[PDB]
Design an enzyme around this catalytic site. Structure first.
Site, PDB file in Angstrom:
ATOM      1  N   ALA A  12       0.804  -1.219   0.000  1.00 40.14           N
ATOM      2  CA  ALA A  12       0.000   0.000   0.000  1.00 40.14           C
ATOM      3  C   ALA A  12       0.845   1.282   0.000  1.00 40.14           C
ATOM      4  CB  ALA A  12      -0.978   0.000   1.156  1.00 40.14           C
ATOM      5  N   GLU A  61       8.862  -8.282   0.023  1.00 42.59           N
ATOM      6  CA  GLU A  61       8.828  -9.101  -1.184  1.00 42.59           C
ATOM      7  C   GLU A  61       8.998  -8.155  -2.390  1.00 42.59           C
ATOM      8  OE1 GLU A  61       6.220 -10.061  -3.686  1.00 42.59           O
ATOM      9  OE2 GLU A  61       4.441  -8.957  -2.992  1.00 42.59           O
ATOM     10  N   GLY A 134       1.279  -7.071   6.718  1.00 43.51           N
ATOM     11  CA  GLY A 134       2.284  -7.550   7.651  1.00 43.51           C
ATOM     12  C   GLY A 134       3.475  -6.621   7.655  1.00 43.51           C
ATOM     13  N   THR A 135       3.861  -6.144   6.457  1.00 45.25           N
ATOM     14  CA  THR A 135       4.985  -5.221   6.305  1.00 45.25           C
ATOM     15  C   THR A 135       4.542  -3.821   6.699  1.00 45.25           C
ATOM     16  OG1 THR A 135       5.968  -6.629   4.591  1.00 45.25           O
ATOM     17  CG2 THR A 135       6.713  -4.317   4.683  1.00 45.25           C
ATOM     18  N   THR A 169      -7.498  -7.815   2.421  1.00 50.50           N
ATOM     19  CA  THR A 169      -6.916  -9.081   1.961  1.00 50.50           C
ATOM     20  C   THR A 169      -6.595 -10.076   3.089  1.00 50.50           C
ATOM     21  OG1 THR A 169      -4.775  -7.951   1.745  1.00 50.50           O
ATOM     22  CG2 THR A 169      -6.103  -8.319  -0.311  1.00 50.50           C
ATOM     23  N   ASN A 218      -5.828   5.126  -5.251  1.00 46.05           N
ATOM     24  CA  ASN A 218      -4.533   5.785  -5.089  1.00 46.05           C
ATOM     25  C   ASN A 218      -4.445   7.110  -5.791  1.00 46.05           C
ATOM     26  OD1 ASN A 218      -3.996   3.434  -3.666  1.00 46.05           O
ATOM     27  ND2 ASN A 218      -2.541   2.640  -5.156  1.00 46.05           N
ATOM     28  N   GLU A 244       5.105  22.624  11.752  1.00 42.25           N
ATOM     29  CA  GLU A 244       3.891  23.439  11.719  1.00 42.25           C
ATOM     30  C   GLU A 244       2.608  22.609  11.738  1.00 42.25           C
ATOM     31  OE1 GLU A 244       4.373  27.084   9.419  1.00 42.25           O
ATOM     32  OE2 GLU A 244       2.179  27.217   9.235  1.00 42.25           O
TER      33      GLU A 244
HETATM   34  N1  LIG Z   1      -5.543   2.296  -0.875  1.00 42.59           N
HETATM   35  C1  LIG Z   1      -4.729   1.248  -1.003  1.00 42.59           C
HETATM   36  N2  LIG Z   1      -4.784   0.258  -0.114  1.00 42.59           N
HETATM   37  C2  LIG Z   1      -3.985  -0.780  -0.441  1.00 42.59           C
HETATM   38  C3  LIG Z   1      -3.152  -0.906  -1.540  1.00 42.59           C
HETATM   39  N3  LIG Z   1      -2.549  -2.156  -1.551  1.00 42.59           N
HETATM   40  C4  LIG Z   1      -3.016  -2.753  -0.477  1.00 42.59           C
HETATM   41  N4  LIG Z   1      -3.890  -1.970   0.244  1.00 42.59           N
HETATM   42  C5  LIG Z   1      -4.510  -2.271   1.543  1.00 42.59           C
HETATM   43  O1  LIG Z   1      -3.485  -2.630   2.455  1.00 42.59           O
HETATM   44  C6  LIG Z   1      -3.888  -3.781   3.229  1.00 42.59           C
HETATM   45  C7  LIG Z   1      -3.010  -4.963   2.892  1.00 42.59           C
HETATM   46  O2  LIG Z   1      -1.655  -4.639   3.232  1.00 42.59           O
HETATM   47  P1  LIG Z   1      -0.512  -4.513   2.125  1.00 42.59           P
HETATM   48  O3  LIG Z   1      -0.024  -3.111   2.113  1.00 42.59           O
HETATM   49  O4  LIG Z   1      -1.021  -5.143   0.887  1.00 42.59           O
HETATM   50  O5  LIG Z   1       0.630  -5.430   2.774  1.00 42.59           O
HETATM   51  P2  LIG Z   1       2.213  -5.296   2.966  1.00 42.59           P
HETATM   52  O6  LIG Z   1       2.535  -4.061   3.723  1.00 42.59           O
HETATM   53  O7  LIG Z   1       2.830  -5.517   1.643  1.00 42.59           O
HETATM   54  O8  LIG Z   1       2.508  -6.571   3.887  1.00 42.59           O
HETATM   55  P3  LIG Z   1       2.719  -8.160   3.655  1.00 42.59           P
HETATM   56  O9  LIG Z   1       2.158  -8.549   2.307  1.00 42.59           O
HETATM   57  O10 LIG Z   1       2.021  -8.872   4.795  1.00 42.59           O
HETATM   58  O11 LIG Z   1       4.227  -8.293   3.722  1.00 42.59           O
HETATM   59  C8  LIG Z   1      -5.380  -3.952   2.938  1.00 42.59           C
HETATM   60  O12 LIG Z   1      -6.108  -3.119   3.834  1.00 42.59           O
HETATM   61  C9  LIG Z   1      -5.486  -3.445   1.498  1.00 42.59           C
HETATM   62  O13 LIG Z   1      -6.789  -3.020   1.126  1.00 42.59           O
HETATM   63  C10 LIG Z   1      -3.083   0.185  -2.464  1.00 42.59           C
HETATM   64  O14 LIG Z   1      -2.412   0.255  -3.493  1.00 42.59           O
HETATM   65  N5  LIG Z   1      -3.917   1.228  -2.101  1.00 42.59           N
HETATM   66 MG   LIG Z   2       2.906  -7.244   0.718  1.00 40.76          MG
END
Ligand SMILES: Nc1nc2c(ncn2[C@@H]2O[C@H](COP(=O)(O)OP(=O)(O)OP(=O)(O)O)[C@@H](O)[C@H]2O)c(=O)[nH]1
Ligand SMILES: [Mg+2]
Ligand SMILES: Nc1nc2c(ncn2[C@@H]2O[C@H](COP(=O)(O)OP(=O)(O)O)[C@@H](O)[C@H]2O)c(=O)[nH]1
Lengths: 425, 83, 52, 431
Positions: A12, A61, A134-135, A169, A218, A244
């Site tokens: 994300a 990853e 998780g990340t 997810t 996004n 600020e």
């Molecule tokens: N708005 C938005 N939410 C996202 C995006 N990708 C994933 N999410 C949200 O983020 C959460 C999932 O976490 P990710 O950011 O995919 O996971 P990560 O930080 O890569 O962690 P791991 O896969 O566990 O290593 C869910 O709430 C998704 O809906 C994105 O591009 N935009």
């Molecule tokens: Mg991930």
């Protein structure tokens, strides 16, 4: 000489950072190769005529960051500031913070340090991440702890993705959210929560996108993030430095979660007036986080305008909004607004879903209503925790059950802080 | 009509100001929590504690699996006693 | 052909289907892929009336 | 790049394993020589999960083929895709297990296990980042059941931090008359409860009933039964083989599907159910897909999902369809059937959509549920086991291999405990 370092953690954070830097480039005339053919205030975000973003992308990853080093902006960022591991945190906070985090924290800190070396007056960090990943959850809190030790005096802003079941997810995202919020609460100076359901509903309603994708979300998110950083990137007058935002928006250290409301979100039409877009700032359907500020109280309210905005029209719109709406503030706070006009026009992605507007506004407010988002998350945490569902995945990684109670007790304390700030006399 | 405009700043691509409608009703600073420094040594101590908890978990699992191996050798020896 | 049908009915406990196949001239000692006759199948599955 | 090591043991394990490779090879454009001939780039994007890239741009399954029955090597090599498998990955004994779990787990199987472990060690170390393992096997025989569970245990010692996933074929007296199959299955379930992270319960009882009652086959053959198995395996692995967000690896699937470690036995389902030779005149609508895949007549385990509650569900929709319509339909079955979903695991039903459909279908859907109704499968095996065990029936075949009668008691008790745990969560309330 007042540089800001952007840090994007997990999928994300990385994908939102792509949309954000894409919009920064359009707003600053920077081509995908770093070249700008055309005020040098953009130097706070961009270092032989090449302009490299002061950003670091980290993911456990590689699939997401691999798209970055392959796409249209493959030459925009230096290869060194795109850091990837081999194994992700599998939607587990304990893996991202403890098991896999330990392996690359030093490398990430080293890469951040290289960007800090290029700075003659580092202001601080802007950390983009999800709550549910998780990340996004585990690695971010681990990184936030280190950043406090290595860069004590520097400010740390967040742009945190709050979970929505439409695009969720993992079933354990409420666990990860509470765990990350608890551990990074002492290390964040101001955090902009972005509820994925609020964004999803804006895309469905205002943009008529039947089933929104992360691309649709996004681009909308970046538009709001850009409004918040325009002050730092251009020579503005409100929010000129990271410190600020704490001065203007956060009165108490734990209550550092401002609500962002953006207007106008129009599908790609007579131009909406200053009064019309200022009124939209008080409608809950235009917020980043789903909650009702009409039930709660305000402690800070900033109106950030962009494009053709006359100060004469802003003052008249505010005058009518007080006499027509009920906008209650806490007893210890003056009822009022900090206004800022950034003459730079609102910029949209050429092929995107959003339309070009003559003027736009982003209201940043610190309301007690944002505690509703915490309450919803805390409830889902409670339903599962009462049965210890999925807890074995965290304990197996070296985490203790007591860490869950510790984080949840801190969340109850935070909900109780929003309650105390809000009583009268 | 009770609007007080305090012009804050005026820059190259910006202009800012505050609009005070009403002053605070509580004439003071209240008490709710009102708030120190975390160390690297303290962080590494907690990270190492979790690392050892995880290691102990895998060692317990391995001990259990290795007992299955001792049992399997007992079974093999028991068949030998018969024929 | 009726031998295969008689073996399915003996295994499946279909008392009336066996009675019909018998009247239509199915081979009582028809064998399956393992040399089992309908009697072996009714004996394995416990269909007393089919055995009788 | 998230590699999976596939292992197939015994006559059933090798039969369904071969069909798995024939089916997923077709989807990815890989012919029996290992060459790619496809139209879509989505076919090769995640080909690495199941295939190694050999010299000459060839693709070779990361599959180990095992059997104590020597004759199994010839039937695998003679199959349509027998040519694609790595010759050194075929590990076969000379003396079978004779439908005896003790022979496969302790004696003949133990004599052959180090030869298999050598070949899994080699495939595992060659992986850039191994996810875990996938074992296809039956629980009613001797090799797949006994040696398969011995392999799981040995693999767990060397790779304890990897996902152990199995496709375990449950026995039914409707398809097999071997008297000892409840013994072999109970001994295997005891092993699976302790040593696997996730298990797909492919029940021969459900497969036979689908063929007989739904597909109208008077005498279903193993080919008929295995058509359902391969169709299931393709569906349940779609998320792992194609680019996607949800349940994209075995670990993220387990975090989403397993709230309590022992409760990792999944009830697989798919729609539309079809026989070999049945043509599709028209594509199912999203409401037909959603309704059918949740139907008890579409489950691959002989359990009534309305006799329990869903702890978690993974729904995979394949083909080109409206995602808005899919979401609406997924919310509709949960709101209309709210009493069969646990209220203390919020948002426990996750839905993925893959653009590529399976062969001969424009639209399809696969269901994976972790339901407390799976206790119906375990109770059925337990009852058959108990009927013989109280008479001490056929025990000399097992104790003659060195086994202790106490192991049968321990396995029975563990499976009975598993059943009580499902019932405990079925009766749990969000207080
Ligand atoms: N708005 C938005 N939410 C996202 C995006 N990708 C994933 N999410 C949200 O983020 C959460 C999932 O976490 P990710 O950011 O995919 O996971 P990560 O930080 O890569 O962690 P791991 O896969 O566990 O290593 C869910 O709430 C998704 O809906 C994105 O591009 N935009
Ligand atoms: Mg991930
Ligand atoms: N679905 C299915 N079940 C099978 C197949 N072959 C055998 N079985 C079942 O597996 C059990 C016998 O195990 P089998 O694999 O033959 O024995 P092994 O060679 O000793 O592992 C019985 O319950 C059979 O009905 C097959 O091709 N498909």
């Amino acid at each position: 000489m007042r540089e800001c370092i952007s840090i994007h953690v997990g999928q994300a954070g990385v994908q939102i950072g792509n949309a954000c830097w894409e919009l920064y480039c359009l707003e600053h005339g920077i081509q995908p190769d770093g070249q700008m053919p055309s005020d040098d205030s953009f130097n706070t975000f961009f270092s032989a005529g090449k302009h490299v973003p002061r950003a670091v992308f980290v993911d456990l990853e590689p699939t997401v960051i691999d798209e970055v080093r392959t796409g249209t902006y493959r030459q925009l960022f230096h290869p060194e500031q795109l850091i990837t591991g081999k194994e992700d945190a599998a939607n587990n906070y304990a893996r991202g913070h403890y098991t896999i985090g330990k392996e690359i924290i030093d490398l990430v800190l080293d890469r951040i340090r290289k960007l800090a070396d290029q700075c003659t007056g580092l202001q601080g960090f802007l950390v983009f991440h999800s709550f549910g990943g998780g990340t996004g959850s585990g690695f971010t809190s681990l990184l936030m702890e280190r950043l406090s030790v290595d860069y004590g005096k520097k400010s740390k802003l967040e742009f945190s993705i709050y979970p929505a079941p439409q695009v969720s997810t993992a079933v354990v995202e409420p666990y990860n959210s509470i765990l990350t919020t608890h551990t990074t609460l002492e290390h964040s100076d101001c955090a902009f929560m972005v509820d994925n359901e609020a964004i999803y509903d804006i895309c469905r309603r205002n943009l008529d996108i039947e089933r929104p994708t992360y691309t649709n979300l996004n681009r909308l998110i970046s538009q709001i993030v850009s409004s918040i950083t325009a002050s730092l990137r251009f020579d503005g007058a409100l929010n000129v430095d990271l410190t600020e935002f704490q001065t203007n928006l956060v009165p108490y250290p734990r209550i550092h979660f401002p609500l962002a409301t953006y207007a106008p979100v129009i599908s790609a039409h007579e131009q909406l007036s200053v009064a019309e877009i200022t009124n939209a700032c008080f409608e809950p359907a235009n917020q980043m986080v789903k909650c009702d500020p009409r039930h709660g109280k305000y402690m800070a309210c900033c109106l950030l305008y962009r494009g053709d905005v006359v100060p004469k029209d802003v003052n008249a719109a505010i005058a009518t909004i007080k006499t027509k709406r009920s906008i209650q503030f806490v007893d210890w706070c003056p009822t009022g607004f900090k206004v800022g006009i950034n003459y730079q026009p609102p910029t949209v992605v050429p092929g995107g879903d959003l339309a070009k507007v003559q003027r736009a506004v982003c209201m940043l407010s610190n309301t007690t209503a944002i505690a509703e988002a915490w309450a919803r998350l805390d409830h889902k945490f409670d339903l599962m925790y009462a049965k210890r569902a999925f807890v074995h995945w965290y304990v197996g990684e070296g985490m203790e059950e007591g860490e869950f109670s510790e984080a949840r007790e801190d969340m109850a304390a935070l909900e109780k802080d929003y309650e105390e700030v809000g009583v009268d006399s | 009509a009770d609007m007080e405009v305090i012009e804050l700043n005026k820059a190259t691509s910006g202009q800012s100001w505050e609009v005070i409608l009403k002053p605070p009703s509580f004439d003071g600073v209240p008490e709710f929590n009102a708030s120190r420094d975390p160390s690297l040594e303290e962080i590494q101590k907690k990270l190492e504690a979790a690392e050892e908890r995880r290691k102990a978990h895998f060692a317990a699992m391995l001990e259990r699996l290795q007992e299955k191996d001792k049992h399997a050798e007992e079974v093999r020896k028991n068949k030998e006693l018969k024929e | 052909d009726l031998g295969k049908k008689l073996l399915e009915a003996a295994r499946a406990g279909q008392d009336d289907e066996v009675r019909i196949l018998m009247a239509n001239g199915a081979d009582v000692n028809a064998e399956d892929d393992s040399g089992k006759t309908p009697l072996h199948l009714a004996a394995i599955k416990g269909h007393l009336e089919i055995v009788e | 790049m998230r590699e999976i090591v596939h292992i197939q043991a015994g006559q059933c394990g090798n039969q369904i394993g071969a069909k798995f490779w024939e089916v997923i090879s077709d989807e990815h454009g890989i012919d029996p020589t290992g060459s790619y001939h496809g139209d879509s780039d989505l076919q090769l994007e995640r080909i690495n999960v199941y295939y190694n890239e050999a010299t000459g741009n060839k693709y070779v399954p990361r599959a180990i083929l095992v059997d104590l029955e020597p004759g199994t090597m010839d039937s695998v090599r003679s199959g349509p895709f027998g040519q694609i498998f790595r010759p050194d990955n075929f590990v076969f004994g000379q003396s079978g297990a004779g439908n005896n779990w003790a022979k496969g787990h302790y004696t003949e199987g133990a004599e052959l296990v180090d030869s298999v472990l050598d070949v899994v060690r080699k495939e595992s170390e060659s992986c850039d980042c191994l996810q875990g393992f996938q074992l296809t096997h039956s629980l009613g025989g001797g090799t797949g059941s006994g040696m398969g569970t011995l392999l799981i245990s040995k693999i767990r010692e060397e790779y304890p931090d990897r996902i152990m996933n199995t496709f375990s074929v449950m026995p039914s007296p409707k398809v097999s008359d071997t008297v000892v199959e409840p013994y072999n299955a109970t001994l295997s379930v005891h092993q699976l409860v302790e040593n696997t992270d996730e298990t797909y319960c492919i029940d021969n009882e459900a497969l036979y009933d689908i063929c007989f009652r739904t597909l109208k086959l008077t005498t279903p053959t193993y080919g008929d039964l295995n058509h359902l198995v391969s169709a299931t395996m393709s569906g349940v692995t779609t998320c792992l083989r194609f680019p996607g967000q949800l349940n994209a690896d075995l670990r993220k699937l387990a975090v989403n599907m397993v709230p309590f470690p022992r409760l990792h036995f999944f009830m697989p389902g798919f729609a539309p159910l079809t026989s070999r030779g049945s043509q599709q005149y028209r594509a199912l609508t999203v409401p037909e897909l959603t309704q059918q895949m949740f139907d008890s007549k579409n489950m691959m385990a002989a359990c009534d999902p309305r006799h329990g509650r869903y702890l978690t569900v993974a729904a995979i929709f394949r083909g080109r369809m409206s995602m808005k319509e899919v979401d609406e339909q997924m919310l509709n079955v949960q709101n209309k059937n709210s009493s069969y979903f646990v209220e203390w695991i919020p948002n426990n039903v996750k839905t993925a959509v893959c653009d590529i459909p399976p062969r001969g279908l424009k639209m399809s859907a696969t269901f994976i549920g972790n339901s407390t109704a799976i206790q119906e499968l375990f109770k059925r095996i337990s009852e058959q086991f108990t009927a013989m065990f109280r008479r001490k029936a056929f025990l000399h075949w097992y104790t003659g291999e060195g086994m202790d009668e106490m192991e049968f008691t321990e396995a029975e008790s563990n499976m009975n405990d598993l059943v009580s745990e499902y019932q405990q969560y079925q009766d749990a309330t969000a207080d």
